[PDB]
């Protein structure tokens, strides 16, 4: 995880029950960015032809 | 639904008019298709006033003509094979 500066504040209804506001700083600072690995495979399957 | 030459004409119509030798290719496909089939470069060049290496450019263009386009649409092709005898022969002379 990362240690984020957080505040306890209603903000125009952007945090109604469980909704969270994030900074443009954090995304600009490339925090929390996630990297994934997808895979592909292929065969030949020799046929009678 | 005709000869690939007609399909080639349709592709050329779809293709941009800026392609070199498009008119020459059209003229050859019109009524000089037999000359192209027999690869009679001498007679074809004499009749059509074909320039040197211009036939090469036309052949290269005809290479990108998507012959048998319906074959590519039928991408699906299940494999068919039967096991029958085995010749694995691991370490030589294996009783596969």
Automatic annotation (TrEMBL), chain B:
**Protein name from the UniProt record:** RNA polymerase sigma-54 factor
Task: Report the protein's function.
Answer: Sigma factors are initiation factors that promote the attachment of RNA polymerase to specific initiation sites and are then released.
Which protein family is it in? Belongs to the sigma-54 factor family.
Region of the whole protein represented: 192 to 287 of 477
């Amino acid at each position: 995880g990362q240690n984020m500066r957080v505040a306890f504040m209603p903000w125009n209804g952007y945090n109604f029950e469980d909704s969270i506001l994030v900074s443009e700083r954090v995304v600009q600072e490339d925090r929390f960015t996630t990297i994934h690995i997808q895979e592909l495979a292929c065969v030949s399957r020799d046929t009678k032809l | 639904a005709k000869d690939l030459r007609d399909c080639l004409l349709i592709q050329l119509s779809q293709f941009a008019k800026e392609t070199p030798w498009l008119e020459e290719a059209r003229l050859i496909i019109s009524d000089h298709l037999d000359l192209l089939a027999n690869h009679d470069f001498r007679t074809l060049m004499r009749v059509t006033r074909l320039k040197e290496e211009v036939l090469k450019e036309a052949v290269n263009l005809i290479q990108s003509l998507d012959p048998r386009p319906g074959q590519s649409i039928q991408t699906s092709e299940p494999e068919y094979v039967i096991p029958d005898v085995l010749v694995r022969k691991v370490s030589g002379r294996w009783t596969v």
